[PDB]
Amino acid sequence: ENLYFQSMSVGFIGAGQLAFALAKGFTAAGVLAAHKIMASSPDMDLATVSALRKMGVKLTPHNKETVQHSDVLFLAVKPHIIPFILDEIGADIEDRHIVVSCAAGVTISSIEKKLSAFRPAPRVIRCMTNTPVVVREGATVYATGTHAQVEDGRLMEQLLSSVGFCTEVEEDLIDAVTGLSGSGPAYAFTALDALADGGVKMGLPRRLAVRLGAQALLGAAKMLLHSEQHPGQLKDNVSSPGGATIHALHVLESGGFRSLLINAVEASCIRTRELQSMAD
Amino acid sequence: NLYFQSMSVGFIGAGQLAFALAKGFTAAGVLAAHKIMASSPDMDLATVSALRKMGVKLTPHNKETVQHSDVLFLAVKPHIIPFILDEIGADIEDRHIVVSCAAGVTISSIEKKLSAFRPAPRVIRCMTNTPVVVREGATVYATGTHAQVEDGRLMEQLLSSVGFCTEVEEDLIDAVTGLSGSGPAYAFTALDALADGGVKMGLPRRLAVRLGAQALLGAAKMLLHSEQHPGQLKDNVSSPGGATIHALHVLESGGFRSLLINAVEASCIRTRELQSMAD
Amino acid sequence: MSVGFIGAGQLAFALAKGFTAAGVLAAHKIMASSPDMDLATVSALRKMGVKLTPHNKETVQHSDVLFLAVKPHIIPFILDEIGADIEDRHIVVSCAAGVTISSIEKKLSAFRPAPRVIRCMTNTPVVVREGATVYATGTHAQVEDGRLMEQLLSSVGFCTEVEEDLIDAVTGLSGSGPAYAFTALDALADGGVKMGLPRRLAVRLGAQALLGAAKMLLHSEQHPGQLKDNVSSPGGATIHALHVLESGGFRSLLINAVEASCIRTRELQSMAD
Amino acid sequence: NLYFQSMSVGFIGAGQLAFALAKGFTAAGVLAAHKIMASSPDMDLATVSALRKMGVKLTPHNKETVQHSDVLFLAVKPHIIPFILDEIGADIEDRHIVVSCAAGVTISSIEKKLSAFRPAPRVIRCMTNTPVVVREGATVYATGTHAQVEDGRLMEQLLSSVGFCTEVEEDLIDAVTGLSGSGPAYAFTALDALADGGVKMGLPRRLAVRLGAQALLGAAKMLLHSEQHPGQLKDNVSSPGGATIHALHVLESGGFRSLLINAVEASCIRTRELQSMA
Amino acid sequence: MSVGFIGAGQLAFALAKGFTAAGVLAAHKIMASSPDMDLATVSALRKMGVKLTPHNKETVQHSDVLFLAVKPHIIPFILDEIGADIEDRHIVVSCAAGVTISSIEKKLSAFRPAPRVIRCMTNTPVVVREGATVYATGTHAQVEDGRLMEQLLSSVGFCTEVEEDLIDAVTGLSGSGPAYAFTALDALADGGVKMGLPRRLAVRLGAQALLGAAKMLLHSEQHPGQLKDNVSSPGGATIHALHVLESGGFRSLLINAVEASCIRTRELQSMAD
Numbered sequence A: 001e002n003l004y005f006q007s008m009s010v011g012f013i014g015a016g017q018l019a020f021a022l023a024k025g026f027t028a029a030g031v032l033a034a035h036k037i038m039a040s041s042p043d044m045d046l047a048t049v050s051a052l053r054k055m056g057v058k059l060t061p062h063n064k065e066t067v068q069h070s071d072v073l074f075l076a077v078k079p080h081i082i083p084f085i086l087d088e089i090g091a092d093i094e095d096r097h098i099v100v101s102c103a104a105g106v107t108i109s110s111i112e113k114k115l116s117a118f119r120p121a122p123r124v125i126r127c128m129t130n131t132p133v134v135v136r137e138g139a140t141v142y143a144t145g146t147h148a149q150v151e152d153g154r155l156m157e158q159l160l161s162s163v164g165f166c167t168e169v170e171e172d173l174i175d176a177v178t179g180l181s182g183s184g185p186a187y188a189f190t191a192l193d194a195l196a197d198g199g200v201k202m203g204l205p206r207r208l209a210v211r212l213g214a215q216a217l218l219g220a221a222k223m224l225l226h227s228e229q230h231p232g233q234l235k236d237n238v239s240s241p242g243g244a245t246i247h248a249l250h251v252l253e254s255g256g257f258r259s260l261l262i263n264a265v266e267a268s269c270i271r272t273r274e275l276q277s278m279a280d
Numbered sequence B: 001n002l003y004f005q006s007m008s009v010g011f012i013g014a015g016q017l018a019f020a021l022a023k024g025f026t027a028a029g030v031l032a033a034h035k036i037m038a039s040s041p042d043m044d045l046a047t048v049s050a051l052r053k054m055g056v057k058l059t060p061h062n063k064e065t066v067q068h069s070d071v072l073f074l075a076v077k078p079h080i081i082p083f084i085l086d087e088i089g090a091d092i093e094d095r096h097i098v099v100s101c102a103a104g105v106t107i108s109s110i111e112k113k114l115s116a117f118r119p120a121p122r123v124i125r126c127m128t129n130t131p132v133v134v135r136e137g138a139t140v141y142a143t144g145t146h147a148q149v150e151d152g153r154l155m156e157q158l159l160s161s162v163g164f165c166t167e168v169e170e171d172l173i174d175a176v177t178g179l180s181g182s183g184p185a186y187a188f189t190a191l192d193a194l195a196d197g198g199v200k201m202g203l204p205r206r207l208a209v210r211l212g213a214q215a216l217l218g219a220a221k222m223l224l225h226s227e228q229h230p231g232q233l234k235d236n237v238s239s240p241g242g243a244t245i246h247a248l249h250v251l252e253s254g255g256f257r258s259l260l261i262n263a264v265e266a267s268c269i270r271t272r273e274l275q276s277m278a279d
Numbered sequence C, E: 001m002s003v004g005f006i007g008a009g010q011l012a013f014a015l016a017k018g019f020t021a022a023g024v025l026a027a028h029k030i031m032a033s034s035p036d037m038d039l040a041t042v043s044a045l046r047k048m049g050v051k052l053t054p055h056n057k058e059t060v061q062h063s064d065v066l067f068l069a070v071k072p073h074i075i076p077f078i079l080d081e082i083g084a085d086i087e088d089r090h091i092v093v094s095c096a097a098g099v100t101i102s103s104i105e106k107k108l109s110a111f112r113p114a115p116r117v118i119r120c121m122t123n124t125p126v127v128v129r130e131g132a133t134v135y136a137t138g139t140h141a142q143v144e145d146g147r148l149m150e151q152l153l154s155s156v157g158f159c160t161e162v163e164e165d166l167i168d169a170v171t172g173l174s175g176s177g178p179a180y181a182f183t184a185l186d187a188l189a190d191g192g193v194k195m196g197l198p199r200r201l202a203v204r205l206g207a208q209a210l211l212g213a214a215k216m217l218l219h220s221e222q223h224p225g226q227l228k229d230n231v232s233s234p235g236g237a238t239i240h241a242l243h244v245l246e247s248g249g250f251r252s253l254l255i256n257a258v259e260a261s262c263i264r265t266r267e268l269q270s271m272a273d
Numbered sequence D: 001n002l003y004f005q006s007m008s009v010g011f012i013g014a015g016q017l018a019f020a021l022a023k024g025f026t027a028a029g030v031l032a033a034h035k036i037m038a039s040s041p042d043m044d045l046a047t048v049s050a051l052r053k054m055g056v057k058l059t060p061h062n063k064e065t066v067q068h069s070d071v072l073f074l075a076v077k078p079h080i081i082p083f084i085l086d087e088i089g090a091d092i093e094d095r096h097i098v099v100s101c102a103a104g105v106t107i108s109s110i111e112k113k114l115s116a117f118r119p120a121p122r123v124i125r126c127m128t129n130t131p132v133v134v135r136e137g138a139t140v141y142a143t144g145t146h147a148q149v150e151d152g153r154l155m156e157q158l159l160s161s162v163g164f165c166t167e168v169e170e171d172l173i174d175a176v177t178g179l180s181g182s183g184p185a186y187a188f189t190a191l192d193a194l195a196d197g198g199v200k201m202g203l204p205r206r207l208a209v210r211l212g213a214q215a216l217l218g219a220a221k222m223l224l225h226s227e228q229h230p231g232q233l234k235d236n237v238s239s240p241g242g243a244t245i246h247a248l249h250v251l252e253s254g255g256f257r258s259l260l261i262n263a264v265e266a267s268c269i270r271t272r273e274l275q276s277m278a
């Protein structure tokens, strides 16, 4: 509302799944006109690029053009690409820019070190988000850089709140957030596929089983978000004595279900830390 | 702009699912709380204490609920159902729609007990879940022998106000129980574990719970709004060599998918057992 | 166009058989050299019509496109043997797993500047013209070099250009993939035999099943999970079998395999460098 | 080809298998799409939409499919078969060849139900799979008590147009179900996982899927065109100390082979159960 | 002495090849009958010099010792086909797994009293004269019948008489044993290849290792655990490898195998009876 009237220009360096998801989310939110977004990519024959083209997002092979168009500039490329990108358009970053890095593991310090060689006070924000911004139910955290104004963090929270949950964190939490909510949707998609397989095994049509499993997970997550109760307490409320649910919970426990999800968060976090160590 | 002006709803049993439906129904604005009555043997229940605050009428006597109500939800444990039907069978009238939410309990068994008192009882079997309390439930129903077409349409309209609702053949309901009946508990277990993972890697517990729940909510919503297979949506998250595909490997190495299949199967089989013992 | 092979083991035979079955090369325009002129793969190229020789230098002098079909540990010795013989006309195509374009160009540049080098990763089903091939172009490979290589290798299966840093991963997937499939086919046949089928029939049916599913996926726009959903009737035989695969961590074993083959390929080159 | 000259085909059931066979048949040029009729209890399915696109005639009444068909494919679940035989049984004539594709359902059970209407029903039992849609199916069939010599011949020619087809004794069919009936789902599972492995090691998903499918297709063709044992072909692929033999070890360490045996066995046993129940 | 085979699959070929290699029977004094006169095992007996025929009755009329080398589910049909043709002179030797002497004698006694029946459990290495055979004598088998059978089958490997109730267990051990060994040899060769040996050499060395160890044990009075102790030098390579076998439950897998083959053999006969 107030952000739409700001008439912001947004740029994405990188035109893959995350850039498409955010562009789709921002336009569905009405905070940005699609034609006020510009995206660049070295490979213009990607499917995500054609989807962005149909939305009306401006597309170019030239990262400099994205930079010059943009007020808020998202870096949506892989971690090992970031230093080459900063070398290439570092001279084109202006005082008016806010540079938002979405690269997993890449530290504000490494970005500011590159950019400060060109102009002395680059405004940098580090972001970690996920694909459900496309349905305006993302989970986003951000940390502000050395030179990011207080108004810069409030602007970014306003923008990212339009497509889901958003909150400021200290940067040292972001690798862990990556393993939880960055990778989280993929754990859920895996779980939903498996639950549907279970529904089909027990005689449900696939379409119904997918719908029911997804509705179950959505409702449960919303319950927890609207409850101040522990998830174990909500689990207890579901499970009647001797009943169907408690029998199913036992077979999950017998396979170490809980430990697998802990293993997943840890593995994603650890990999995020070693992608940056390979950079560093 | 739905509102059932001439419908009175009663709950026999005042436990978790009764409160959840009454809360969902009232939050939806389709029923005034004062047109809902609930009966319970343990009037010191925490759920029976909350229903009073909403304005739901409470009574200790199942006969009062039956006499007050047109739509009668049977929200009791499965083994109590034949004792309930023995109690109020002679009080069932033509106007009544009896909606059983008892897991596993067949329409045939309910109709056989009620038909000893008055022929043609109108019976609908329901399987729903606790997220109706936030109007995001997953409900299926099957109509009995003597249920009229308007009965099912009315129940679907009512249960659609608190989440997804669709008609199914009765022999699918034990499997629905294993999937969406028990599913929220699988999700609560997963969210506790994901939060433990976040805490292990250094996040505060409160933030970890919030992020994990938001992640699951968003992913579920994506799937419901997409025509794409969940495997395609999974593919879009995982960048080559990246954090997510490394985490997906450790889920696979533990047989994560098989445990969720095991769970649906175990809940379904137990539902079939509970009934085969009722017979 | 004349083609030569340094090395005459399994992969050299598979390419030459595929190329000539494709009609893109005449067998008499192909030359192959081997140290052990007693390998069974050597006698097969003989019956095929390929010109044979023990001298690596003869192959170089007779061919324009030069395939290096030797084990990765022998490439430096081959380059040191023939490096003085490479000319402006030669396109050197290394099929050795792990071996970098950099390492080939370094050895050859000591003899003549700007060697034209291509790195290729292919697999044995080129012998039935259904291989899977990727290639990366070297520093001095001209534009027509890559296009020529794609034209040649597309005649024996799928072929596409990649950045060289993907090739070790390709090795773990389609380079080693046929071996995973042969293992799977042996095991599926054992399962058919356990359940009462004659071995010959069980082999034929399992192989046909795998061929048809692979073709379905290549010819469909749909995700393999969606095609899986279409096979599995509710409550049926297939979804019961898929559960027992999942319970054993079937998917993770295949991920483990691609990872292990890729990592070993990286080790083999690190030991070379 | 004079077998298929004036032949009309009907599918009772409009699910995934009826669609796959109708697509395969029309793609093969054996039958014309308009000469094919299908019936379903729910004309609002996903597959019934595609069949309408192809030009196949659709109806909600199975009696209409029977009266319009020479070769009648029963493409429904095994528990529905006795209900369908009760429904259309009085309409089966001496001209009809009844082809059951239901898993586990025995020729004897079908003949018993149809013999109450007319005494010599011509029955064939079939087990095929979804890759008939690209004419690379794997099909077996067994002929019933009253199937004429030309009947199995016609069936052989029809199903060979869409892939491999051979006659078997009926007592092998449950085992074939576990192997080539369910087989494609094992392959799709394996291809999804192999692509995940490629992605973990840095490949784009689209490329990883293409390479994995091509690897599987090429290996399968190699074995079909070779007289050699699959273990021999495996040995030819594995260079000493190399990448492939290292990957084969980790497959062996997880019992990869036993999982595929388990799968064939579980599918076969479920097929026997579905019949022993119904 | 004239010998016949009803059945001409793997086991019939192995016995006939072993017998004639042993010099105890002339190939022209051997007759074999099969329904599928197109099996590869049938053409091998042809090249060997064995007289072939499709008619089970011809084999019976031409031979004195009559081997039943058919699958266990076909024995009753064979007995019903030829039972009227058995005479005083015939010794009927059933090699079908699980099939009891009782069931054979019951079917044959309906035609002529006192049929002379032997039950045998052998294995494929009779083809190289290193088989393992046990036999049990029937109710009406004379004393010279057992001694003759031991003389014949000792020419193609180890042979001893047993009580019939041990034969299902023997089936699980030496009947199925060669298959366990072939599996073990394939896996040991894979291990040699992983560690850098060429496949042909790894197969030869692994097979020689197994042959020599088996011969050591047969020729020694010592317990296999004691011979194991003699191989394993303290701190050495062998004792490290034995630990990893133990950690995987190697011994229990072999016990599982003998048990599973024995139990299945009992099931197959229970289904027959």
Ligand SMILES: O=C(O)c1ccc2[nH]c(=O)[nH]c(=O)c2c1
Residues within 6 Å of the ligand: A018, A102, A103, A104, A127, A128, A129, A130, A182, A183, B237, B238, B239, B242, B243, B244, B245
């Ligand atoms: O590589 C991955 O698995 C992955 C997952 C989520 C992510 N979310 C985000 O905001 N930036 C990222 O790079 C990102 C990467």
Ligand SMILES: O=C(O)c1ccc2[nH]c(=O)[nH]c(=O)c2c1
Residues within 6 Å of the ligand: A238, A239, A240, A243, A244, A245, A246, B017, B101, B102, B103, B126, B127, B128, B129, B181, B182
């Ligand atoms: O025992 C349980 O865990 C359980 C779970 C979900 C349920 N949903 C419903 O509608 N009625 C029920 O009894 C029910 C019971």
Ligand SMILES: O=C(O)c1ccc2[nH]c(=O)[nH]c(=O)c2c1
Residues within 6 Å of the ligand: C011, C072, C095, C096, C097, C120, C121, C122, C123, C175, C176, D237, D238, D239, D242, D243, D244, D245
């Ligand atoms: O040793 C191996 O496991 C192996 C497998 C496939 C290969 N394909 C190719 O093109 N060059 C290679 O060296 C190669 C090696």
Ligand SMILES: O=C(O)c1ccc2[nH]c(=O)[nH]c(=O)c2c1
Residues within 6 Å of the ligand: C231, C232, C233, C235, C236, C237, C238, C239, D017, D101, D102, D103, D126, D127, D128, D129, D177, D181, D182
């Ligand atoms: O139950 C199943 O999963 C299944 C799988 C493959 C099949 N192929 C066929 O031809 N008829 C079938 O019923 C069939 C059923």
Ligand SMILES: O=C(O)c1ccc2[nH]c(=O)[nH]c(=O)c2c1
Residues within 6 Å of the ligand: E011, E072, E095, E096, E097, E120, E121, E122, E123, E175, E176
């Ligand atoms: O089917 C089997 O696994 C098997 C193995 C060994 C055998 N040895 C013998 O003498 N008669 C048999 O039937 C036999 C059967």
